[PDB]
Every structure is written in C-alpha cells, then in structure tokens.
Ligand binder design. Structure first.
Ligand SMILES: Cc1[nH]nc2c1[C@](c1cc(N3CCC(CCC(=O)O)CC3)cc(C(F)(F)F)c1)(C(C)C)C(C#N)=C(N)O2
Ligand SMILES: Cc1[nH]nc2c1[C@](c1cc(N3CCC(CCC(=O)O)CC3)cc(C(F)(F)F)c1)(C(C)C)C(C#N)=C(N)O2
Ligand SMILES: Cc1ncc(COP(=O)(O)O)c(CNCC(=O)O)c1O
Ligand SMILES: Cc1ncc(COP(=O)(O)O)c(CNCC(=O)O)c1O
Ligand SMILES: [Cl-]
Lengths: 442, 442
C-alpha cells in the first residue's frame, strides 16, 4: 500500500529545485573549506534500505534482533576507521554513531567531564568551533558553554595559537578538557605542547580534526593520535564522506573510557543510529586508505599552496601569510571592504566562499575576511596552474566590490543594490560558469 | 580526481551485505512498532547531491550564500509540515533541522527550560522514551535526567496513564515542562487533561507524537495541537519518512518561542543541516497530505484492531486489553516466558518484534512482554484477514518458546542453545519466508 513512482512524477515541484541545485553546484567555483562532493557510491549507501532499521545499542548488544547484517556494517565501519587513521584496534576505540560533528563533540565532551564540567577551547573569532565552548557577553551561544564551564583562549595578533596564553589560562582555570583542532585555522597544530599543558593540569587532550582529517590520515600533517585522549572528526569535508561523525578514544591512556564514550552517544544523547550513514561512511573509509586518495590529499595541499602564493603575488594579505593545509583566510582590511560584501559579490559570480573573522576584529558582526579552501575544487580536477585563474577571479571580485562600495557606500542594504545587473559581474559569472561547468563532476 | 565506479564494483564487500539486508527485510514479518519502509522517491532524496551543501542558520539568514535552492527546499518542507498537521502558519511554527527524535526532544526541552530546568515525563518501564527524562537510581541514563532535573510518572497496574498521579506530582514537583506522547503506549492521550495540569502549575505542555504522528495528522486520534505548546515528532515511523525529526511550537500561546526553539536547534546543539533529510522529508510530507495516505493510516488501525482481537481469541493477554492505535504490547506472564526469549525465538523465524516491559515489571532485564505494531506490514499490503496468520505465527512461537524453556531451562544462554536447527522453527521460518517474500516491497 505505497506509491512507487519515481521522484520526477511523484514530486515534480521538488525534483526541479534539486535539478536546479545540481546545476548550481556544477557551475560554481566552490571554495567553502568545509565542503566536498561525494561520489555515486557513497550516495547509493545514503539511499539504501538499510535506513529502515532500528538498531539501538552497539554490535552484538542490540536491543532488537534482526541486526546481523547491520552488525556487520557497523563493525566493518569501525575496523575501516581505525585502519584509515593508523591506530591499533587494541590501543584505540571508535564510535561510528554520532549523526554530525556537533553531536559528536558534545557527546565526547560530556563523557569526559559531565554537566558543569570545565573545558577550554579556541575562541570562534580566532578559528574555534561553536562546540568548543563558544559564548558571548549577551548569551551562552553553544550548549558547550551552558552545560559546561568554558574558558576561551585567543590566538595572537599574527593569527597563531599562543601556547603561553593557553598555559597561563590552563593553570588558573584548571579544566578537565582542553580542545585543539579548529574550524578556520590555516596552520598545523603542535599537539605535543598541548599534551604537555594538559599533563600539568591533569586535563584530557581533545583534538577535533574535521577540517584536516585527510591530512592526518595520510601522514601529511602532524598526528594527534600520538598525544590525544580523544579525537573527533566529521566525515563530509576533506575526507569526502557523508554527513556524519567519528569519535576516537585512547584506551591505554584511559581504560574504561570506551564505555563512557559509548554510553554518551547512546543512550545519553542519541537513539537509533542512521545505518545509511554508517554504510556510506564505510564505503568512503575504504577509499581513504587507498594510495589514490593520498594523491588527492597531496593535491589539496599543493593547490592550497599555489592558491595562497598566487593571491600574495596580487598583493592580497593572508592570515599567517600562508598555509600548511587546505584552507586560507584572506584579510581584507587593506581594501577597506568587509567579508560580507565580498561574499555577496562572489555569490553573484557563482564563487562559493564564507565570511570569516580575523585577529583584529572585536566582534563577529562585520568580519574583515573570507575563508577559502581547495578540497571541493581539487575533487573536481583542478591542478596548481588552475589556481592563478581562481586567484584572478577573487582579485577581480575584490576590485568590483571596492568599485560598488565607492558608488553606493558601505551600508550593506545600499551595497547589495549595486549588485543586480552589473556588467562586469555578468561577465565574471559567465567566465566562472564556463570554466566550472566543464570540470569533472561526481 | 574521483572514483565514479558503482557501489558493486567499488565496494563488493559492503554491497553484498546490503543485498543481504535487502533480502532479510523482504522475507521478514516486521512487527517493530517504530519501523516502516520508505519508497523509492524518499531514497532518491536521501541520495541527492543536496547533502553537499553547508547551510548553517535558517532560510534568508544563511551564513553562506549560494543557498537559493536550499532555502526553497527548507521553506517547502516547513510549509508542507504545517499543512500536513492541519495548523495555521500564523499560529504555529516548525523547525525541520533536527537530525533525529532524540536530538529534537533534547533541543526543544532545552529551549523551554534550560540547564537545571525541571521536567516531568513518563517512566521508561511504563512506556516513556529515554529523552523524556529517564534515569535509574544507579545512573542518569539520559542526558535529559542529567542536564535537567526530572521526575517520572508511572502508569497504573492496568497499563493506563493515571492523571491523579501526574497532578499529585506536578503540584509537589513544580516542573516547567510536562511531557506526554510515548514510545510504547497502546492507548490515546487525554491532552486536554494534560493542559489542565500544566496550567495549574504554570508548566509547558510537551507532546511527543512520533509513534502516532499519522493518526494525529489524518485526524483518527486526539489532536495535541489544540492544547500543546510544543509538539515533537520523528519522521521515520508511522509517517513513513526518512530518519529525521520536526519540532512544532505554538506562537500564539507563547510569543518569542520561535527564536528560543530555533536558537536551541542552532547554534546551541547542531551545526550544518542535513539537506538530503529535509528534501526527503518534504517529499514524504506531500504524500502525507493526500487522501490516499489517510486510507493507509486507517488501514494501520484496522490491522492493529484485528491483530489484537486475534491474539485475544488465542487467549493471549494484551496490556490495557486492546489498542487505540498501531501498537500492541503482549503480557507473557501467563506463559512463564520472558520477552527476551520470545524475541530470539521470533528472530529465528524471521519475525521482527522487540521485548518490552509491562506494569508488573520492576526491571529492564527480564521484561515480561513484547511490543508489536502494524505500520510496516500495512505498508507491505497486508489487510485485516492476514492478521490471523500473524497472530497464528506468534502463538506458535510462544508455544515453541515454552517447549524450549521446558527442555533447556530458563537461563538465556542455555535457552538460546535450543534454537539452532529446531525442526519446528525451520518449518515456521519457511512458512514466514514464503508469505513475506510474496508481499509488495517498496
Ligand atoms: C557558521 C560557523 N560555524 N562554526 C564556525 C562558523 C564561522 C562563523 C560563525 C559566526 N557566528 C557568530 C554568531 C553565532 C550565533 C550568535 C547568536 O545568534 O546567538 C553564529 C555563528 C559568524 C561568522 C562571521 F562573523 F559571520 F564571519 C563566522 C564560519 C566558519 C562561517 C567561524 C568563523 N569565523 C568559525 N570559527 O566557526
Ligand atoms: C530501546 C528503547 N528506546 N526507547 C525505548 C526503548 C524500550 C526499551 C529500553 C530499554 N533500556 C533500558 C536500559 C537503558 C540503558 C541502561 C544503561 O545505561 O546501561 C537502555 C534502554 C530496555 C527495554 C527492555 F529491555 F525491554 F526492558 C526496552 C523499547 C521500545 C525497545 C522501551 C521500553 N520498554 C521504551 N519505553 O522506550
Ligand atoms: C572543527 C569542527 N568541528 C565540528 C563541526 C561541526 O560539524 P556539523 O556541522 O556536522 O555539526 C565543524 C563545521 N564547521 C563549519 C565550517 O567549517 O564550514 C568544524 O569545523
Ligand atoms: C516518543 C519517541 N521519541 C523519540 C524517539 C527517538 O527517535 P530517534 O531514534 O530518531 O532518536 C523514539 C524512538 N523509540 C524507539 C522505538 O519505539 O522503537 C520515540 O518512541
Ligand atoms: Cl542521511
């Protein structure tokens, strides 16, 4: 007693918009540092009937039976995760049920410290995530600031993590956890010195490597597994997985953390897992381990270096003046434009990027930068030589953004009015669309 | 720079298990009350490239641009949700970003009362959910018992909600929120009466209708929208959507609830929405509003009534001696077997059901029942006449279970030893497999 008609016949209204979305992605220069494009096989898993099944609990300890085939997929996923991150299944455990990065971090944080527990993280304005304890004067913005007691450690004026400030804070504040790994930080992390500070205060070391997961997996960047008690990561960014998250815990350093983490995910926070997620994750974790994916991850860093270098050749300032990873943050202060204005401009030319804060900003309203990343475009086949052209389009967009701000003024309302119909934008968009439109598309 | 090979070629190991899982669903009598089978269209949405997009925030307030099409999908879903549940968009709002039921309830509860907030809900043993405040003296099992202060109200010895007990507790406990709507409750709710208690204490009325959503939507059962401040529901059970959740809030009764709820979902708890879910949800929400889906919902009740009656005709006891909805809970005490034993037995014959507590029970180890429901089988085309055969199969399994307990004893390890190779079970399985394999499969 069901309607089995295909999507186009059953819901033409929705199917048009999705064909629209597909086309916009096809014709966009996507520089969102956190975005990627999944292959057909990962999306076959997302659409699989495995999502029909309720399997609360863990493998071989299901509440319900009929979870033989589901148990194999959940076990194949955890095996593959421990493999991809080069850790012994004897030494590290992994939980594959968190629905997204934000859920994974709140869950893992809870396990370690509980309600009212003390945590430390990087400020949002310096590149930290919301789930690293972010709050404001006006309100406790993240649950992580409300259910926990959180202190935030700023980066220095050059955009680097200042460990002295971390230590001075750690000693006075005395938290149970210190978080490292960030949302928009363009350099590598010194996990060793984080571990040193954590031992001084007897705090746990939490590394959130969602943005740099692929680098860590393929030994391109520093390895937090050597020093961290907990490692969280999302699966949908540089890793090229579905939208999901993983929690890694170090049994040797902390026996009986396996149960604490596992009970936090369920039944403390979540109910039934999403088995289509878990299957999709497993499918991508196979690909991660292959030598082909390392090459891709290497290519992300090459493109990221080339992009930074080309932007500097056109007199654009980058926070920390470069990058060790897939992402860059452009400081726009010398151009007297805001990140929000540049974003609109770039949306009008089918260039995807996000506004971002820089060290000098005192508030998240009117941030002075934009953040870009290479994983999506590297997925679409762009090489180092293609980066000059991307850098070219961004500089032209910065120029137009200045021109339009000169004409209509700095108020965003007024600035946006200049945007529709602009000859140069129509010309730049068209250029963007022609080059983007022909790049390989999974 | 990607691998576009289909799932079968890319990952033969995973693809086998999913074909296996597909076969087991096809050849199972699925009586899990919370399970259903999604159509091909809903799975096309879950596999859509729309999950590539990051769109933190809400429509027309996205952090990033390039969300023109994603904004349309999110609005079409919120529209369709309010249509489906017969509520005016001037009077009620809906949030479509929660990733799953447990997340939606934690989010909504936080919105209403905050950390340390006082809440009341039905006990797990009596048919409440984990996210309704469940704890044990030994441990705060749910974050809802830990990040909130919760009190738990039991059903009477006949398995009914006792409102006197609710009021006696509300007046002394003084909670800010009172939760009704349940995970394994076979009767309808007196929402009007819950509102009356809430007003007396000045508490919010929270109705979780995940199990009965369709009945509420198509008007077969009581309407909590008439009396409730907040209504939560999952989309994957009787509603037949994907694995996701919806939070409804009454603007009229409480202005500025819209921001409080929306702020709780983001940025308080979650980050990026899962846009494939929202697309998938929109697709099912169209189907929900059709007069055809009402017919299916009506059929779920007709089949649930017929099933209860046939079980009773075979002298099987049902909690509350019947049902108003899609689910039944069987009291196994007169047979001196546990629900855990019947569940293994049933898994051996490809019948999916789950163990469940009853009012007499004092423990979630050795619960004295099983819970069954008709939505999945109604989805597969089974009618009233087919229920005798299901009832016949369950009675036979109950009989076989008693025989095996007689032969190998009551210890579960010893009992399980009896199952492999049993002639009657092998015969019963094949009887099941022949009837199940024939039924329409979306
Ligand atoms: C949207 C988002 N999520 N997590 C982030 C961000 C970034 C960001 C966040 C934010 N937020 C600040 C306010 C907060 C909620 C306040 C409230 O309404 O209660 C919502 C988020 C703002 C920006 C900004 F300023 F617009 F560039 C970037 C970025 C990646 C888009 C950010 C930065 N910079 C960092 N570090 O992390
Ligand atoms: C698995 C699950 N989720 N939500 C539920 C359940 C049910 C259920 C839950 C549970 N749990 C009790 C222990 C709890 C965790 C304790 C720990 O931290 O170690 C885990 C869950 C047990 C049963 C059982 F086994 F039938 F009694 C059913 C059922 C529908 C499967 C239930 C009942 N009865 C109710 N009311 O709600
Ligand atoms: C370090 C980090 N952790 C967690 C998350 C949360 O993931 P979910 O959105 O799946 O909850 C993000 C996403 N940050 C947004 C961005 O970089 O664009 C992140 O950067
Ligand atoms: C009332 C209620 N609320 C929330 C949930 C949680 O849904 P998620 O699993 O999507 O978090 C359940 C599932 N209860 C399990 C069952 O009936 O089988 C439920 O019964
Ligand atoms: Cl999904």
């Amino acid at each position: 007693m069901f309607n089995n008609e295909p999507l186009e016949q059953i819901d033409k209204e929705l199917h048009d918009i999705l064909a629209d979305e597909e086309k916009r992605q096809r014709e966009t220069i996507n520089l969102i540092a956190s975005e990627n494009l999944t292959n057909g096989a990962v999306r076959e898993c997302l659409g699989n009937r495995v999502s029909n099944k309720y399997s609360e609990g863990y493998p071989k300890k299901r509440y319900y039976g009929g979870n033989d085939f589901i148990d194999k997929i959940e076990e194949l996923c955890q095996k593959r995760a421990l493999e991809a991150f080069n850790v012994s299944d004897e030494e590290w455990g992994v939980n594959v049920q968190p629905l997204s990065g934000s859920a994974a971090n709140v869950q893992a944080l809870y396990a370690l410290v509980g309600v009212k527990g003390k945590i430390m993280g990087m400020h949002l304005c310096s590149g930290g995530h919301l789930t690293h304890g972010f709050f404001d004067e006006k309100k406790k913005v993240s649950i992580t600031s409300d259910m926990f007691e959180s202190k935030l450690y700023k980066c220095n004026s050059q955009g680097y993590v200042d460990l002295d400030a971390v230590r001075e804070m750690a000693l006075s504040f005395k938290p149970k956890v210190i978080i490292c790994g960030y949302t928009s930080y363009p350099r590598d992390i010194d996990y060793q010195q984080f571990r040193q500070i954590c031992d001084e205060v007897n705090a746990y070391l939490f590394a959130d490597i969602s943005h740099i997961s692929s680098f860590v997996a393929c030994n391109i960047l520093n390895n937090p597994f050597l020093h961290a008690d907990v490692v969280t990561t999302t699966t949908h960014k540089i890793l090229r997985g579905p939208r999901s998250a993983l929690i890694f815990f170090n049994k040797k350093r902390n026996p009986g953390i396996e149960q604490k983490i596992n009970s936090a995910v369920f039944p403390s926070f979540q109910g039934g897992p999403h088995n289509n997620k878990i299957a999709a994750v497993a499918c991508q974790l196979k690909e991660v381990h292959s030598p082909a994916f390392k090459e891709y991850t290497q290519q992300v860093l090459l493109n990221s270096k080339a992009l930074a270098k080309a932007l500097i050749s056109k007199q654009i300032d980058l926070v920390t003046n470069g990058t060790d990873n897939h992402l860059i943050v452009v400081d726009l202060r010398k151009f007297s434009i805001t990140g929000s204005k540049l974003q609109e401009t770039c949306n009008a030319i089918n260039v995807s990027l996000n506004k971002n804060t820089i060290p000098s900003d005192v508030d998240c309203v009117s941030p002075s930068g934009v953040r870009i990343g290479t994983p999506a475009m590297t997925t679409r086949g762009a090489k180092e030589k293609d980066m000059e052209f991307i850098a070219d389009v961004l500089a032209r967009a910065i120029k137009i953004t200045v021109d339009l701000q000169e004409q209509y003024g700095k108020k965003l309302v007024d600035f946006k009015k200049g945007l529709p119909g602009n000859a140069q934008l129509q010309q730049l968009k068209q250029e963007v669309v022609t080059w983007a439109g022909a790049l390989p598309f999974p």
